[PDB]
Amino acid sequence: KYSGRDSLIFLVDASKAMFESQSEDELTPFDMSIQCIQSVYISKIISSDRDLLAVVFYGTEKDKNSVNFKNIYVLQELDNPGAKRILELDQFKGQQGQKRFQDMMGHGSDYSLSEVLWVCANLFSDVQFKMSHKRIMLFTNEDNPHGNDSAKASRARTKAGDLRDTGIFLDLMHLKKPGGFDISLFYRDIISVHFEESSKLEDLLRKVRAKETRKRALSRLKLKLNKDIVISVGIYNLVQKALKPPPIKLYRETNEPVKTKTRTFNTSTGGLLLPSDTKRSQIYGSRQIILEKEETEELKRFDDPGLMLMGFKPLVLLKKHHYLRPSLFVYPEESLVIGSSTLFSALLIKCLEKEVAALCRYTPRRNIPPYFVALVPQEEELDDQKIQVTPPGFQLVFLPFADDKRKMPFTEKIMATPEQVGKMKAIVEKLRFTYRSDSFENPVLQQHFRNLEALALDLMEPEQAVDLTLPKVEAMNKRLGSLVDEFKELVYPPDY
Amino acid sequence: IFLEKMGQKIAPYSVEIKNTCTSVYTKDRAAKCKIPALDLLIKLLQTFRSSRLMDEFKIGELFSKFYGELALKKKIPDTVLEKVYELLGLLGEVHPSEMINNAENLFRAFLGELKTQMTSAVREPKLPVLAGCLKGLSSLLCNFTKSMEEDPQTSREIFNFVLKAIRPQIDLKRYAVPSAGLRLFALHASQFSTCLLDNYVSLFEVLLKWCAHTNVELKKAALSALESFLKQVSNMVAKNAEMHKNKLQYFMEQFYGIIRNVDSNNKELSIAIRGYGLFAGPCKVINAKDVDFMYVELIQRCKQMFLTQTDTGDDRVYQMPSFLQSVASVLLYLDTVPEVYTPVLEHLVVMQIDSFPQY
Amino acid sequence: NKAAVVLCMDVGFTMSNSIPGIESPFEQAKKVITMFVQRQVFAENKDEIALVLFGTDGTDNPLSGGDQYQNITVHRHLMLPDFDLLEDIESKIQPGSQQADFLDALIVSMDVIQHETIGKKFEKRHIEIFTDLSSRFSKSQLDIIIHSLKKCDISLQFFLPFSLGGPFRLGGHGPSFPLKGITEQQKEGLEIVKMVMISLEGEDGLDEIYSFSESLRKLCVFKKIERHSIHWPCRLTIGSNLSIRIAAYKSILQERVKKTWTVVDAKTLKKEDIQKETVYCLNDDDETEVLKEDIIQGFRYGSDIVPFSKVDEEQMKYKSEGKCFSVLGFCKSSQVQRRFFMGNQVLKVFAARDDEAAAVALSSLIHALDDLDMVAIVRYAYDKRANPQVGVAFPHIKHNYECLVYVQLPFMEDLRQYMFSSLKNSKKYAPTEAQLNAVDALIDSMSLAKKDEKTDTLEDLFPTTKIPNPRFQRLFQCLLHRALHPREPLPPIQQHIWNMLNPPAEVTTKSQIPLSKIKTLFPLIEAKKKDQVTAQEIFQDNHSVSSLAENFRVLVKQKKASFE
DNA sequence: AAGCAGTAGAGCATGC
DNA sequence: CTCTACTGCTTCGATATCG
DNA sequence: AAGCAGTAGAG
DNA sequence: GCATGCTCTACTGCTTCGATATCG
């Protein structure tokens, strides 16, 4: 659905064989799984903090589940990520965290994979919210568990069928296992070629820390043709200028919110003043125009909300430098009117022939003055692994008014000699790269995320995000090898 | 529900219940908790209304506590604001002595919100807040009357909002705004009266259309508002009949038009008969000979309906109270009773006494 | 910085008599002049506006010697326009039954600049003339009017009722002139103003003669009156060493209302008696007031609010280290798609206004990017407090100017994935070939760009980037309407607002056939309700008892219908 | 100011 | 008297606030 | 915060 | 003029976004 959260259970095989790693200048698989789980917590605490996470330890002596089963320790329930839930997981880090872990958890115990999948199913059952995906990440290094037995093996395959009936899909994060990881002994039929470490733990250690919003529609309008031919659209947005979250005023001695209340009162008698006994004014030198709070919202209303089509236009008149507002994306909604998708698709694949674009008056909300907007059609681009990059529909391009443009002063046209143009073409060909779409990253926002992480987890000092929007002065210099001095000598006079 | 079950036996515990209600309103966040706190508070003030506990309820402090909320109304949602306006009016109904020097502020707040909710071409009206303001204004107009002789501006504004509230809208569900308008009209039609004479045809047609509705509660409220309308209009005509003859003629010809018709359906016939007997004072001052023809043909009608035409065994006896009240009203303005119809009248009222447990 | 306008208005005899099927031309002059002056009064400008009429039955000008310079009353002088002129344009302007000279209106307006502005220091000097070209002029000041204003640097703009080339609503980009909307004296005066303007300037005075309709939907009345936007100076640095000194000007920026709506109180009408406070309570039982120094700001981190003070906020934060317009690379065109443009503004980056070397360097860069079909990627920061950002600087070669146009580009955080269902690979949404033919007919019937009789020129009907914002042309008229008649409610919208916001009739009335075709071809069933109904539509609905065969004989004897 | 999931009770049909 | 500061003020981006 | 342009300290 | 469910409408909570007022 839409309000459905994403749930995830981290299942770590803290039994016996992740605590004596064979290199000692490398990192034990228990520490690898703990660093991975902690990076997912730090990523999801500001990426999508409405999701639910849990970590369960099996192969451990002491137990803390609800059924009081043998050798299953549930460290945390399914709940939203927090600072204390990362500080509790901090204790089992490094070569010392093993020793901190042994004295209060357990180790090397017998277990049953059926009962650990049972405890994970009970964790998913006890959730009162609605869940979109339910997943179990299995951190294990031994393939073929319960190798001495087959009743345990068949019961485990049965309880995995029980899990996959209800919609829970587990995946294994296999660890090293010197001697390969044979994925076919036990873990090809339980889950939805010898190996080394993985291809998922390493890019799961890459903390992304970028907020992700679900697909809401932002407007559900009716696209009218004259007064009669109305079809229903939704006006989505695909670029939106991520902001930092706003601060919350706290009480300094308690660190609790403080419930701001603003009131208007007159300084004559100090009496509480309602919204009915004020007006709105503007003073122009000596005249005072006095409207009301209702009448100031009447000045703006022109049309009804929706899109009024006003003909069609070739794209050659839609100038690229005519930009004032980030574009939106329209898409037919075939539930407020029937056949909306058919009329949209006919209009789409018929404006896709020529370079024509629908022109509209866009009224998003009620008492909002109209804007002229250009519905440029677009096809879809996809691949054979069904990754689509452009969805089909129109791109709603806002066009400026006469007073949104501004004029420039007079500037002389001082053209260049073709020697200068040809020696600047070499300069621009030397520095060429590929702009993907999402190679760059907001440094102010990233540093805010880093500072908040380091102040809530009270680590040692704020990590600095390595800047990326900055230019590389030495690399650009050595790329442009000994060229810019002769270019500025050839185009610039020998002075200054 | 426990305060409904046990009534004034809650009296040693009521002040702590009031402090708990006020605390839950000011500290809890959900509308689902602020609404029953105000429901319990309103029911508490209605229960321990006439008592000595109304000094222990600091009613004047409760007015400041809930009048500050209208100023910091920073989305108090809708159905909390309904209860807040109803509570503010009920503070003027019960214990009005600690509410004398802030009744005018409260009238200003009620009329400002009613104006914002009905006279706004910017947005859809919030019907909970409309029902709440009309409830609170109907409670404040007890003990703080705003009549058409003392100050006619406030009474004309209140009548205009009531007349907008009770107007029929085709394709209407949610009959809380028309019910609150009709109940304020049924209680206080006496207070706006000069506003009531000149809008008389429209008010009669609206109140007569609302009485044939499907809802029990809206129809009951409309019947009460209609009898209050007819009572006030006849009392206004009976003081000055040298310029209200046309109104008297319209009302009499309307009552006769309902009476002659066989589309009675017993509610319309009962209100025709009741108003027909109600307009007898004005007929006594306008003709002096007409209240004698009334009660002759009204007794002939009572006789033919349920006395000797033995048409019993049907839905015939369920308008006998209305006929009896009408004869009782016409008989007051009649000097020199004929004495030919007196045994018929006596037999009619003892037949009413006989047919008492059938109701 | 300032200017000065003097406004010649036609109050002639034939100026206000003809109302055949259109609006009266003198009142159209009133509409355009009220659109000109209400913007200048409501924008709080420092400009001089003098009203001068011609065709008037009085006269008072500096040199009215003889029959020349007659029938002309300068109504006010170079002075800041108050609301008096605003109300006098509709009240104390009456039409005239008097045909006066029109070329002499220019030469009487050519005195006020050298008389009233005798010691003040101006920058722009403009004469606006609303004429009719219908009176026998005086062709004696021919080279006088032409050498004089070129000697003392005066700008001029003319206005006919009809420019050079579906009922006349007021002009909705349709018929700018009717079947007979010109007299022979109009033709003679039109010819003399065309030749006097081309002989005045050369090739560019022809673009300053606008009809009333087309100027009512355009900003030509402020074209030679708007000021110059300020410069952003920096240095375009392509490497650590190369530095091109640049100036950037905001090309497109969405202009919004600058004057607020001050909250005054009712029944006193003063902003000063009322004062708001924003106290901070606590969430205890009786909410205790706390001061503004017991409050620290805090941020949400998961399921808890962590304290983050403001001095620590300024200490640990990003540091922009000043303004910059560096270059990160030059990718190419068509990697930067148009749908990823991000900011609120458009920058146009020129060189220095004074540097021949920086101009030839910037021109070589622009021409290199134009030749390679490549664009640039920059890191623009405004100053030390602005956030840094990336964007695209693409070439914009012209024949009149040349510059780099910079539009901001998204970050990774600013992108939404949002998969959508396919429409060309759908099954039950594939249109029929007849329905495809029908929408092809509708598209071809509703074009708005018609190639004239020329080679490849595509001048388009209904251009929606030249129309002014209707928001201000409603706000100014309602502010006028309550500064002049302060009791009546808000008026309806003006008709020319809808006329400039609608498409013309030659595309409206043509396409009635395919609209009526697809109305029957595509079945559309809507199943909703209750959309946009206000409280002013819900709760406004108005908009002797003894007499209560021979009776039939009465009915026959007095008055009745058909018998029997 | 609007989308979007979730619910509670208002208003009404129905009962032979 | 002929050259550099103070105020103005004008702007603009980021921030907070509200429907 | 940031900057250019009218009027006042400088021997 | 009563009793019992059933449908579905209208409201709330949460969350995003955009317009407006304000501050370094």
Ligand SMILES: O=P(O)(O)O[C@H]1[C@H](OP(=O)(O)O)[C@H](OP(=O)(O)O)[C@H](OP(=O)(O)O)[C@@H](OP(=O)(O)O)[C@H]1OP(=O)(O)O
């Ligand atoms: O002749 P138009 O179709 O009305 O447009 C022209 C011109 O178009 P061309 O490039 O074909 O000559 C410019 O259009 P853009 O550069 O905006 O795309 C425009 O420039 P500005 O709007 O930036 O001012 C302006 O020409 P100019 O710059 O000389 O004013 C304008 O002519 P108008 O000013 O008469 O509208």
